[PDB]
Every structure is written in C-alpha cells, then in structure tokens.
Amino acid sequence: MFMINILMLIIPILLAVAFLTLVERKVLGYMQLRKGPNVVGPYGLLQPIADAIKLFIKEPLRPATSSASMFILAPIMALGLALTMWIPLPMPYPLINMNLGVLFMLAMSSLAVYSILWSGWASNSKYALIGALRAVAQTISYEVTLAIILLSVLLMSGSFTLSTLITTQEQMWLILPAWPLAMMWFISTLAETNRAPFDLTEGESELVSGFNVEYAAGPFALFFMAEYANIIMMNIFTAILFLGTSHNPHMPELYTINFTIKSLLLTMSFLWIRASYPRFRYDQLMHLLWKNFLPLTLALCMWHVSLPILTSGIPPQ
Amino acid sequence: KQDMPPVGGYGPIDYKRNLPRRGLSGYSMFAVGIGALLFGYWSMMKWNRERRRLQIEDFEARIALMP
Ligand SMILES: CCCCCCCCCCCCCCCCCC(=O)OC[C@H](COP(=O)(O)OCCN)OC(=O)CCCCCCCCCCCCCCCCC
Ligand SMILES: CCCCCCCCCCCCCCCCCC(=O)OC[C@H](COP(=O)(O)OCCN)OC(=O)CCCCCCCCCCCCCCCCC
C-alpha cells in the first residue's frame, strides 16, 4: 500500500491550493473593509468548486502564430516539479528518507525557470518575448542570495539530512542565533517565487504580466494552480528549518497539529505584504541584490565558519 | 426665514500633521539585538557539545561488537 500513500498526498493538497484562492481574497478583503464572497457559499466555502468547472468548459484556443511542441510541454514541467518537490519533506515522517535532500530542494527549485524561458519563447512576440527574458534574469540572481545563506545554517546543523534539522532544534527555535540570515531568507523566497512587491513575472503594470498573457483557461488553469503550489511549499520549508517544532515518537499525532498551524501563519504574510507595498521598478529590484543584499551574506558566511571553531562547539556527524 | 447657519457650535478640526512617537531608538536598538543573539550562541555549546558526547556513545556500541 505504498501506491495508496502517494495518491493520499497529491489529492488532499489540490484542495489546499483551491481553498487558498478563496482565503486569498477574504483576508485581502477585510483589509479594505469589505466582506468575503457573500452569496454563493453560503460563507464563500463552495466558491472554488464552481470557479473550477468554468475554466474547463471555456474554449482553449491555441495562438495561430505559435509553435507546437514547446507550448504544450511547459505546463507538463510546471505541475511536475511543483508536485515532485513535496516528496522528501518530513511531517514528522517523510515519504522518502533521502540521505541528502536539502540539496535536492535546490535540485528542484532550479529547473522551474526553464519553463518560463520556454513559454515566453514558445508562443509569441514582445509582450512575452523580451518581457519574459527579464523574468528569467531576476530568478537566476536570487539563488546566490539563497544558496549561501541556506548553507550558512548547515554549518550549525551538522549534515545534509532533514531528520537532524529537527533534532538540533529541540530547545532553541533557531531563528534566534541567526536572525540576520532569517531576514534575507524571507525576501529571497518573496522574490524568487514571483510575488507581489518584486513583481514583473505575474505582472502589474509591467509586461502586463506577459508570462500568462496568452494562455486561455484550458492550459492557464494549471499555471495558476501549479504556481500556488510553490508558495505553500517554501512556507512548509521555512518552518522545518528555522521555526522547528518538537517531535515525540510515542505521540506523532500532536506533531502535525502544532505544525500545520505554523506554515499557515507564514503563508498569511504573502497575502499580508501585497496589501501594503508598491513595486520595485526593475533596476532597483536587482540594484539591491548585488550592491546591498550580497556582501552581508558573505560576511555572515565567514562569521558562521569561525564561530563553531572558536567556541569548540562542532556539530556532530 | 428658514435658513441654515447656526449661532454657535463649532470646532474646528485641525490642519496639523503629527505622529512622531519614539519608539525605542538610538543605542537602545543594536543593544537588544546583540543581547538576544549572544543568548543564542550561549544556548549553543550546551547542546551541540552535548550531542557530540552522545555521538561517541553511538559509535561505542558499534565497536564493542564486530569481532
Ligand atoms: C513528459 C513526460 C516524459 C518524461 C517523464 C520522465 C520525467 C522524469 C523527471 C524526474 C527528474 C527527477 C530526477 C531527480 C534525480 C535525483 C534523485 C535522487 O537523488 O534521489 C536521492 C537518492 C540519493 O541516494 P541516497 O539519498 O543516498 O539514498 C539513501 C540510501 N541510504 O537517490 C535514490 O534514492 C535512488 C537513486 C536511484 C533511483 C533511480 C534513478 C533516479 C532517476 C530516474 C529517472 C532518470 C531521470 C530522467 C531524466 C530527468 C529529466 C528531467
Ligand atoms: C559585532 C557583533 C556582530 C554584529 C552583528 C550585527 C547584526 C546586524 C544585522 C544586519 C543585517 C540584516 C539586515 C539586512 C539588511 C537590510 C537589507 C538592505 O540593506 O536594504 C537596503 C535598502 C536600500 O535602500 P536604502 O539604502 O535605504 O536607500 C533608499 C533611501 N532613500 O533599503 C531598504 O530598507 C529596503 C527594505 C527591504 C526591501 C523589501 C521590502 C519589501 C517588504 C519586505 C518586508 C519583510 C518583513 C520581514 C520579513 C519577515 C521576517 C520574519
């Protein structure tokens, strides 16, 4: 019954991305002083099952001046890596016990930009031709802001597995000994996964969001779908790394209860940022990576190399 | 003879501009930060050092067998 476990994880998470689109706007609504979806629910709660069927009735045109084998291959690789990344992730037991899987996250988070380079090219012209080229350019630069300060906690964890990442935090809630790194951990995933203040991928008044701009609601229904699957997955990855919960072997039930409550709270922030702050005007977006984000990340890197040595506090492995 | 303006009852409301509430600034910050961070590393070396002791016990049970 291994095969019944995989389907027990793909299916209960497509609701949690469909019942986030509803909480996308109720939370964003009471900031504006207005109620949620009022009339169809009764409370709203039945909105996404009606708002899903309309997309698969509405005619999925392909553009006449488009290519063929590239345009319908990027949504295959969209939902592939958006759902494959949920595998090696402990809660409290992961589906797969990888020896080194923290690196496997970057082995999965690297190839997502290789679909945007397809879809911006595969269909058509300037509102997604050059307008998606400068969306690959922001997402590549926020790995070296990411991969360094992901390594900067592993000097204190001890190894590459994720079971040690819960063992080392039984008494600490490790956001305290590394709170400068925890800041730039947030803004990276806030800009890499293409969200509200550092936007130009989706597109406000930029490429009039020319990375979708062309998908009718047949193939478009996943892009949004798949994408919303990253944003609840960097939140499930931050809360297993910094704000780690407590594991008890005799009681694994109380792990998940105290766990899903925490990833939901960080997921609120991606909604709660959007209702405050304006955009970044593509220069100043990348003007603060090199000049401003990056030299501090090397500074704490050299700090976290020497401090396990000159404390005589080497983590065991 | 039924016309508006009252004989009295007025404010007015201000034209002013003020909300400068401070705020715990100016060497109060950078002092709670370092004082919190050094409590973190002090909470290290009591766990990472202690886990290093149980680590050797885990290798110990290996070596006492395997002849
Ligand atoms: C459009 C449809 C057509 C395309 C359909 C196919 C699409 C497939 C794309 C999937 C890409 C995922 C590739 C990821 C490779 C990384 C896998 C990995 O590293 O697993 C971790 C583990 C490492 O070993 P370890 O951790 O030490 O095991 C514990 C031992 N105590 O390793 C293991 O546990 C076992 C290692 C051997 C397992 C078999 C080999 C894994 C790769 C098989 C697929 C080959 C890749 C196909 C090409 C990819 C294209 C993107
Ligand atoms: C000797 C002992 C050792 C000493 C250790 C001391 C530790 C010190 C730790 C310091 C390092 C951590 C702080 C990180 C640096 C902050 C990033 C930065 O430098 O931003 C600079 C940015 C540039 O703009 P600026 O310079 O202000 O010029 C324009 C003025 N007209 O100006 C900005 O402010 C930009 C602000 C961020 C831009 C994105 C804002 C979007 C919203 C993000 C909200 C995030 C909220 C928190 C994240 C979640 C936290 C859990």
Q: Is some CB atom of chain B closer than 8 A to the CB atom of A310?
A: no
Q: What are phi and psi of A279, to 5 degrees?
A: -80, -170
Query: What torsion, rounded to 10 degrees, do the Cα atoms A212, A213, A215, A217 define?
Result: 90
Residue type (1 letter), A211: F
C-alpha separations of A231 from A140, A278, A293, B13 in Å: 18, 20, 22, 46
* CA A303 to centroid of ligand 2, rounded, Å: 18
- Resolution, angstroms, 1 dp: 3.8
Contacts of A49 by beta carbon, 8 Å cutoff, 6+ apart: A18
* CA A187 to centroid of ligand 2, rounded, Å: 10
Q: Is A300 in the pocket of ligand 2 (CB under 6 A)?
A: no
C-alpha separations of A187 from A144, A199, A220, A281 in Å: 13, 12, 27, 16
d(CA A236, CA A252): 18
d(CA A7, CA A91): 17
Residues found in chain A: 317
d(CA B50, CA A316): 9
Contacts of B27 by beta carbon, 8 Å cutoff, 6+ apart: none
d(CA A197, CA A281): 10
Token representation of residue A91: 């809660």
First to last CA, chain B: 117
Contacts of A293 by beta carbon, 8 Å cutoff, 6+ apart: A145, A184, A187
- Record: contact A314-B36, CB cut-off 8 A: no
d(CA A147, CA A239): 17
CB atoms within 10 A of CB B36: 12
